[PDB]
């Protein structure tokens, strides 16, 4: 049934990060089976030293990963398991290739990876729009009166389910700190909260006053990082981004104006974010470079 899946997952060899290409910003998931994305996820926890430092039992981490995946099964494509898996992959690539890993504590890295994986688990719970089909990120802003939201209840419920407690090896003080960061990183994937707080982040960077060691600026930086990862399909190699963008038209759920939608999207949201991210961490330039190349391809298409 799904004992089968867990048994098969826990027994399998976990290939290296290099084999799985999860350290690349150009990572493509389409050829992977769901079960291979779970192996990729295990590898992310492993290479961030989270399995070791917090003594996560292998079977427990496998079951938690499958619990998370299972609870995405009714979500639309922009908020599904593949979305959260890729949000996590971008986080991993930005932590590793982008080197952000070195700037953060282990509890921050742990909360970030769990948040990336879990941030859309409540999409059907806290939204009455947006759940029939994948809606453009900016449909929030211009189309519906009420915006598109995220929550952490499902996240914490799965984390505390018997057999799924990847955090049992934390002390009480570590657990409390981690849950707090998880809650904020999940709420930060609300585009409303990004728009509300980004100008300050940009000013600090413009004025070269950005100080990651300030508790308000660390919260704000972790939030921008969550948004960078959540929106990262806008950075992908052109064929990936085209087919994801077109899901607003192609998703079967039980293309004429898309070029101008995506250019507007890049000009109003995406370009500044990856520009700002690259000033904090120069090795995240591939996200910005990808976002630039896609604007150029979408602009050429808009010129028909
Ligand atoms: C931060 O989110 C992303 C970043 C980079 C690539 C992304 C996404 C994302 O949201 N997604 C979500 C949609 C979908 C993806 N991969 C899939 C594989 C099979 C089916 C799918 O949708 C039905 C996808 C898929 N990709 C490629």
3-state secondary structure 92-105: HHHHCCCCHHHHCC
- Residue 234 in contact with ligand 1 by CB distance below 6 A: no
The resolution, in angstroms to one decimal, equals 2.3
- Residue 75 in contact with ligand 1 by CB distance below 6 A: no
Identify whether 151 is a catalytic site residue.
no
Are 164 and 156 in contact, with CB atoms under 8 Å apart? no
Query: Could you tell which of 83, 274, 290 is best to mutate to test the pocket of ligand 1, judged by most ligand atoms within 8 Å of the CB?
Result: 83
Within 10 A of 18 (CB to CB), how many other CB atoms are there?
Answer: 11
Neighbouring residues of 148: CB distance < 8 A, sequence distance ≥ 6 = 127, 129, 130, 135, 137, 139, 140, 190, 191
Alpha-carbon span 222 to 188, nearest angstrom: 8
- Annotation-wise, does 149 bind a ligand? no
Q: Which of 286, 291, 173 is nearest to 238 (CA)?
A: 291
User: How is residue 212 written in tokens?
Assistant: 């990651």
Experimental technique behind these coordinates: X-ray
Q: Work out whether the CA dihedral 191, 134, 90, 184 comes out positive or negative.
A: positive
What spacing in Å lies between the alpha carbon of 78 and ligand 1's midpoint? 7
262's torsion region: left (phi>0), alpha (psi -120 to 50) or beta?
alpha
| DSSP, res 55 | T
- Annotation-wise, does 150 bind a ligand? no
Alpha-carbon span 247 to 254, nearest angstrom: 14
Q: Which of 80, 83, 42 is nearest to 64 (CA)?
A: 42
Alpha-carbon span 65 to 231, nearest angstrom: 22
Are 26 and 4 in contact, with CB atoms under 8 Å apart? no
* Cα separation values, 170 from 45, 118, 174, Å: 15, 19, 6
**Burial zone of 219 (CB within 10 Å; 0-12 exposed, 13-18 middle, 19+ buried):** middle
- Annotation-wise, does 119 bind a ligand? yes
Q: Which of 136, 139, 119 is nearest to 188 (CA)?
A: 119
């Amino acid at each position: 049934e799904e004992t089968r899946e867990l048994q098969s997952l826990a027994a399998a060899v976990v290939p290296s990060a290099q084999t799985l290409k999860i350290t690349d910003f150009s990572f493509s998931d389409f050829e992977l089976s769901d079960l291979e994305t779970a192996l990729c996820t295990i590898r992310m926890f492993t290479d961030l030293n989270l399995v070791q430092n917090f003594q996560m039992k292998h079977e427990v981490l496998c079951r938690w990963i499958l619990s998370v995946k299972k609870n995405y099964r009714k979500n639309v494509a922009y908020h599904n398991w593949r979305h959260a898996f890729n949000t996590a992959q971008c986080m991993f690539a930005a932590l590793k290739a982008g080197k952000i890993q070195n700037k953060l504590t282990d509890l921050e890295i742990l909360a970030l990876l769990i948040a990336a994986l879990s941030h859309d688990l409540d999409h059907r719970g806290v939204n009455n729009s947006y759940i029939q089909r994948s809606e453009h990120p900016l449909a929030q802003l211009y189309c519906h009166s009420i915006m598109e939201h995220h929550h952490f209840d499902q996240c914490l419920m799965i984390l505390n389910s018997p057999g799924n407690q990847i955090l049992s090896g934390l002390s009480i003080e570590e657990y409390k700190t981690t849950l707090k960061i998880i809650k904020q990183a999940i709420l930060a994937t609300d585009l409303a909260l990004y728009i509300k707080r980004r100008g300050e982040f940009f000013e600090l960077i413009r004025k070269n006053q950005f100080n990651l060691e300030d508790p308000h600026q660390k919260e704000l930086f972790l939030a921008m990082l969550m948004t960078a990862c959540d929106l990262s399909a806008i950075t992908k190699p052109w064929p990936i981004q085209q087919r994801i963008a077109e899901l607003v038209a192609t998703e079967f759920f039980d293309k004429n104006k898309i070029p101008s939608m995506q250019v507007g999207f890049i000009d109003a949201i995406c370009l500044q974010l990856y520009e700002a991210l690259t000033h904090v961490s120069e090795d995240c330039f591939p996200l910005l470079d990808g976002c630039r190349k896609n604007r150029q391809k979408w602009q050429a298409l808009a010129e028909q």
